[PDB]
Amino acid sequence: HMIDYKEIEVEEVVGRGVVCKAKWRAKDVAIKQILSRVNHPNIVKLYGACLNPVCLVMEYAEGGSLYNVLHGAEPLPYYTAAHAMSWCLQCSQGVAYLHSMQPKALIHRDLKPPNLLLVAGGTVLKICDFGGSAAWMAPEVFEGSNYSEKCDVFSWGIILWEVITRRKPFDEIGGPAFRIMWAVHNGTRPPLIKNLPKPIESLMTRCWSKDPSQRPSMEEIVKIMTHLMRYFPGADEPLQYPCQHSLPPGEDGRVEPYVDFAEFYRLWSVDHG
Numbered sequence: 001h002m003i004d005y006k007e008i009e010v011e012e013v014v015g016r017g018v019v020c021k022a023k024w025r026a027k028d029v030a031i032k033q034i035l036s037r038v039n040h041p042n043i044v045k046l047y048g049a050c051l052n053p054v055c056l057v058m059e060y061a062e063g064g065s066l067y068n069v070l071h072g073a074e075p076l077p078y079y080t081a082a083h084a085m086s087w088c089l090q091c092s093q094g095v096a097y098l099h100s101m102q103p104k105a106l107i108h109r110d111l112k113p114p115n116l117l118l119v120a121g122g123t124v125l126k127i128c129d130f131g132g133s134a135a136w137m138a139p140e141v142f143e144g145s146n147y148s149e150k151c152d153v154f155s156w157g158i159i160l161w162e163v164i165t166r167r168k169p170f171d172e173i174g175g176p177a178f179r180i181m182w183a184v185h186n187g188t189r190p191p192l193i194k195n196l197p198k199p200i201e202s203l204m205t206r207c208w209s210k211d212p213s214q215r216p217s218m219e220e221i222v223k224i225m226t227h228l229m230r231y232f233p234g235a236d237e238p239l240q241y242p243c244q245h246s247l248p249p250g251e252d253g254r255v256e257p258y259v260d261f262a263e264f265y266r267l268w269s270v271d272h273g
């Protein structure tokens, strides 16, 4: 659609290259002043666009960004292993859809929690795109190599590590972006997670492979994640309990998960033994 700007009522700035919450036809909306075949539940919908000032009109995500949920200002919300696996399943479903786009695949290129928006009490995730991103970028990208949709698989793997640990990836490296690029180019990866279930560890590290052809397709991730949710009930629970979270010491190349996998091991055991 081609929206009339006067029909919109701007409100508070949301992000700042500036995004603001607004009403348009009694519908809450996000707008942004200085592709259309995309229709998926896990991708922020583009309603239309105005002409002067030229601006995008998109659905509004009331929950803010995943990054904000994970690492934002106190008070931070509690969340569970089911939430973590659900966010990543929903992210892979949105991204699989982009990769299936005809006649040419759409690669996100910038998959990272600051661009993953939440709604429905923090339970539904939606990919947003307008394109310190080094931390989620596949090495072939910033070495100027020819990349493919496998670069998004790499980013997803980092995100999976991130929601399970509630840690910023490569937070210990710091300095400018080039230090992380150098690190990851040389094979450094986020530390392994104590007690992580072997199937999730297998999936995560595969996604981190240096060789992009050794990473799984997104369609494979979606399917694997779909079937693992049988062991992660509770993803529909709205985020609503308070959390006081503090970084446990992290050395020995081994960090503790923030989420708890005891119930996964219990439900797995019922099925298998």
Ligand SMILES: *CC(=O)Nc1ccccc1Oc1nc(Nc2ccc(N3CCN(C)CC3)cc2)ncc1Cl
Residues within 6 Å of the ligand: 014, 015, 016, 019, 030, 044, 058, 059, 060, 061, 062, 063, 064, 065, 068, 114, 115, 117, 127, 128, 129, 130
């Ligand atoms: C695609 C993208 O990067 N989107 C995006 C990033 C940052 C801000 C806004 C963006 O677009 C956007 N945002 C939203 N909803 C939303 C709601 C609240 C917030 N807050 C919550 C409190 N914080 C302190 C930070 C911001 C951020 C974003 N809906 C849709 C769209 Cl397109």
